[PDB]
Design goal:
This is part of a larger assembly, with three copies of chain A (about 500 residues). Chain A is an alpha/beta fold and about 500 residues long. Chain A has 16 helices and twelve strands. In chain A, the strands form three sheets. The first copy, chain A, has a five-stranded mixed beta sheet with strand order 1-4-6-5-7. In chain A, strands 9-8-10-11-12 form a five-stranded parallel beta sheet. In chain A, about 50% of the residues are buried. Chains in contact: A-B, A-C, B-C. Chains A, B, C: Pfam families: ELFV_dehydrog, ELFV_dehydrog_N.
């Protein structure tokens, strides 16, 4: 039951050693100078540790009038890619080593989904419950200030983001505080932080992002005969049956999209209890049940399962919640053949070894829930373009599409003595609804898909190159370390 | 006749009270702290008044050598949307109230056409006719300087624009003066002001912008069966017949585009006289007549009407000139069912109540002449993009289009033993032209059309929502207020 | 009675026309180009009107939770001298015209005392008595912010200052708000405003500044045989007898210092009533009386005089209170020969003419109460020096002094067989107190005295140059206009 930090770090060292060799021979061994290039692995030593970590201690006057000093910290893992990216966590269980760890994860994660951002992470030792909306605000802002004055929040330095503990409300404050203070003259002040309200410069499709990422991440592999054979998957009768642990944002959507495409949800577990039903569970029903009242407990059309759903018999198990939920203990008691990490670090290193032994394909957090980050990239861009995606092309494109059809029509009618006989100028029903309901989220969603696909293939190619089996995790880390390295390498350090 | 500031104010307060109640219940009553969220209407009382207004006296050495002080002002209504936008006036009738008023209009007008700009407006108590080109330049530059040193010109702060009293020449100077002085280090210096020459970073399709706007504005509503029924329009034999008051550069185009689509111009006024002809009047002909010599008076194919063509018997009357031309007096004497405000404030509040009483749909100036602004937004972006729209797509697109058609061809050929029989690969005449002559102005004009439309639906949906009839005006202002509010709300003021 | 604007403007014109002529002839008629140099009096036309004037409307959330919008303005008269200087007034009566006027006064006043600052002046339509300390703060800050973002509050742009309606507490806030936000990177952030607490970067000797100024102003003229003869003053039996109208800060000190040097206070009025006693009145007593309880009414050793002390028979009458207290009505009824304006505009133009008819010397407000400003200059400097005056010289000096004395002693003891006989190494009692209690205030107070004196002689010289009598006012303005002009002239405008 290791702890985040000594989990990630292992993962790195793992896929650091596996790259070192190859990373010298073949890649750069044709201009080998004193074969001391193997001492250039010092670039890997630099990548491992966070380059900067700022600890704070600011005060805020509670609503009752009493003073109080809040402590928090933000760590920036790497700068290989200028603008650092990472969330902000409001919890009373947020250690410097936790942030440092997550921040490390970020860099690699971003690499995997080709996002030009360095890994960061922030944490404020506070418990939102114990503060009033007004207080919270006061905190986020004073935080933003300090964070700014020391180069830890800037649209070209570090762009924060929400976490399970924080929301778009906070982000909106961060943004605004910044813009109305130290970034007053910055024409891209609002790009200092993402995950903010649409009105404040947010990007359409943020919410569903992470969730949709999980889906495409699974999709890409579930549709790869090769892998699906090693597991004896891509059925004919069974088709697809999954389970999701944690009905949060990510979990909910993950079950929405997964279900939409033929998969059947057999079990959903939460902090409270769980749910079971071989027949299937409908996303909207369970969603409206959890929105109408308390939790998911006492949901009709579903027997209350007891304990975690991590042992429910299904094909795909998606851990979209807490940390380290799959350990060396319950690792051999999992039915599922595929584990989709819809969260960070939901499986321990020991558990990984087991799963590998009994052919269990674990889709890396490092890649699966990199959907939010991918879209946050878009939000950043959308603030640099200062325009909502497709604002200037939708109409143009529409016209061009109708000209295309009209050309086929006129050109097919000139193969007959008519002037309105053939009727190609009519788009399909789907294609019509697309055109008529074109909107930013469509450009976003599509860009997401594209990235999750490209990345997927990339991981697969890397797992076939280093002969790995279903160890997609290390593959991904390796993939990442190779990218981060290349940047550093093709420059240096001080003589970079 | 009330003045411009009284009107606009009234309009605001009108919409402001309409919103208030719905703005609390339904749209935020779900987490209603001690229902004091009625006291949040303060937001509205912050939005109403301009938040800044700079008055300034600056000297210039007249050509003859003599010194003279020039006084002018610039008012920034709101900063809810960072870059303020507004035009510069050069008239000896300006008045700190006027600029405050028009700057108030701008904010709302931008909101309507989803343009991320705050409302601003400048004014220099001067009369261009009494100053040499050289002098005028001196002025516009000094003015830019002072305006810059105080934060009232700046690609991120405030982006000025031309008015009927200024031109691209001036704007060019403003842009250059700024980029050669204060904004020397700003990589977006030439985005400090719009409406500039092409060679100075201007955007194609500026001249026809406002005009085209008018058209689309009208078009969107004259295509809506619902509204066209309440009037008894969208006829089968009368089709469309319109009249334009003021043959300026908005009026002229308005006629051109209106006419080009099956509408017949039956009357065209001016500041001199008028024109009449139930058979119709050709735009080109009347244009060439005006351009070839003097005014439109003495135009063949047309009997010299006497008085204002605001009484002519037509379907659509488009006031594209002076201010307050439709008052309580002549309000009842109109024969047109639709009044398209191709100018600002061409109808008084009293007139509006009359037109409503005798079912007369008045398309708001707040929306109908927002075309120019909409495009100015594009110019700004163009300047930030550092590339002419389409530059890197036109060719790519072209290719992709041909491949599309080729596919349909080849594909269809397969259903026949021939390799050249069916020729879909040929684009319609129109489509060809479009492809061959693809320029920036096409992307621009299309983006415009897309904004006018979306905005038109938005206004309609708002009208229906607050069960407003043909009072599109208030409906628009309400629509605006709502937007501007949302921004403020989803943040605050100091604790924003 | 004419308002402040009308007056100050008149004063300017007056001096302006007196300087024009001479300002061309002997000054610069040697290079005389075209003799058009008269047309270079345009300079003057630029100097008269304020160059900028910002009007704002910013919100604050009152303690009760309600939301109000505060309106206020700042006006910068001239920039001829880089940092503008001027106070901030918190009263319901403030009017754009008022600030403009007072700003205008500053520029000239500073010129008189050789202070390198432009003339500025703020104003916030608000009555401090209606707001809680918290609320006041919240206003000063939000005001400082908006005032900064538009270039009306920086250490090198415009340095505000306290008024009778605002104190050091508000300044402190201004300073801090600025240095925490916009000016965060400015190493001289705390030089953005003056009149702030000592612990915030304030200079020692600010409270006795304006008062002491009034004293040295009077002292310099009451010591000039020439002027004192025209009035038959500098007596040998009557010595000195004065009267002060207004027992505010300036008035109190004025009496303290005046009295300390032989004068004899015979009457002191207030907003309530007055006091009279030919025998004399002791500052400390009357001070303690006021402090101890209520006003000055009921004070022992003094018969309650009814009305204004302006008519009390005395030598020097010092109006240290409200505006326009000496008009064309009571002007003839004055018994004093000298009128020391310890306030701004306490005598109307029409009163001035009268006093000049019956040889009454009126020492100009423009000069007399320029003591505060003079010291505020020091405070500014103090903040830019980053060290308290004397900090690194007191000790050194002390030592030097003793060595001086000990050199006289040893040297004198060498003219007599004795090593200890003569004792010149002993300072006087006064000297010793000075040495032992050396502190910043001393350096300040000295510098102030030096300025008031040099400025006094400058005024005189001017008066005698332009052959003005006891019309010290115009003489001062003229003296100012000359200075301001010289700057502009020895440069230009655009081609400056």
């Amino acid at each position: 039951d290791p702890n985040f930090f000594k989990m990630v770090e292992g993962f790195f060292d793992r896929g650091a050693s596996i790259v070192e060799d190859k990373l010298v021979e073949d890649l750069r061994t044709r201009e080998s100078e004193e074969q001391k290039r193997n001492r250039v692995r010092g670039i890997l030593r630099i990548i491992k540790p966070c380059n900067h970590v700022l600890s704070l201690s600011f005060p805020i006057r509670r609503d009752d009038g009493s003073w109080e000093v809040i402590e928090g910290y933000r760590a920036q893992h790497s700068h290989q890619r200028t603008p650092c990216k990472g969330g902000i966590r409001y919890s009373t269980d947020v250690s410097v080593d936790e942030v440092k760890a997550l921040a490390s994860l970020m860099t690699y994660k971003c690499a995997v989904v080709d996002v030009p951002f360095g890994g960061a992470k922030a944490g404020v030792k506070i418990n939102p419950k114990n503060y009033t909306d007004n207080e919270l605000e006061k905190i986020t802002r004073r935080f933003t200030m300090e964070l700014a004055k020391k180069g830890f929040i800037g649209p070209g330095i570090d762009v924060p983001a929400p976490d399970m503990s924080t929301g778009e409300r906070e982000m909106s404050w961060i943004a605004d505080t910044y813009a109305s203070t130290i970034g007053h003259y910055d024409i891209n002040a609002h790009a200092c932080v993402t995950g903010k309200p649409i009105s404040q410069g947010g990007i359409h499709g943020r919410i569903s992002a992470t969730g949709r990422g999980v889906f495409h991440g699974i999709e890409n592999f579930i549709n790869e005969a090769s892998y699906m054979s090693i597991l004896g998957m891509t059925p004919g009768f069974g088709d697809k049956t999954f389970v999701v642990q944690g009905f949060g944002n990510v979990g909910l959507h993950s079950m929405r999209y997964l279900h939409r495409f033929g998969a059947k949800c057999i079990a959903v577990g939460e902090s409270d209890g769980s749910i079971w039903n071989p027949d299937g569970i409908d996303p909207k029903e369970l969603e409206d049940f959890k929105l109408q009242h308390g939790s998911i407990l006492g949901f009709p059309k579903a027997k209350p399962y007891e304990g975690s759903i991590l042992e429910a018999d299904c094909d795909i198990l998606i851990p979209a919640a807490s940390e380290k939920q799959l350990t060396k203990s319950n690792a051999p008691r999992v039915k599922a053949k595929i584990i989709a990490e819809g969260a960070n670090g939901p499986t321990t290193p020991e558990a990984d070894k087991i799963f590998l032994e009994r052919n269990i394909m674990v889709i890396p957090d490092l890649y699966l829930n990199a959907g939010g980050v991918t879209v946050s990239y878009f939000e950043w861009l959308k603030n640099l373009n200062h325009v909502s995606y497709g604002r200037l092309t939708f109409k143009y494109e529409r016209d061009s599409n109708y000209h295309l059809l009209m050309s086929v029509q006129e050109s097919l009618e000139r193969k007959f003595g008519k002037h309105g006989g053939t009727i190609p100028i009519v788009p399909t029903a789907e294609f019509q609804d697309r055109i008529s309901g074109a909107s930013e989220k469509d450009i976003v969603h599509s860009g997401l898909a594209y990235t999750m696909e490209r990345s997927a293939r990339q991981i697969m190619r890397t797992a076939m190159k280093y002969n790995l089996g279903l160890d997609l995790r290390t593959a991904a880390y390796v993939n990442a370390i190779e990218k981060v390295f290349k940047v550093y390498n093709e420059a240096g350090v001080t003589f970079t």
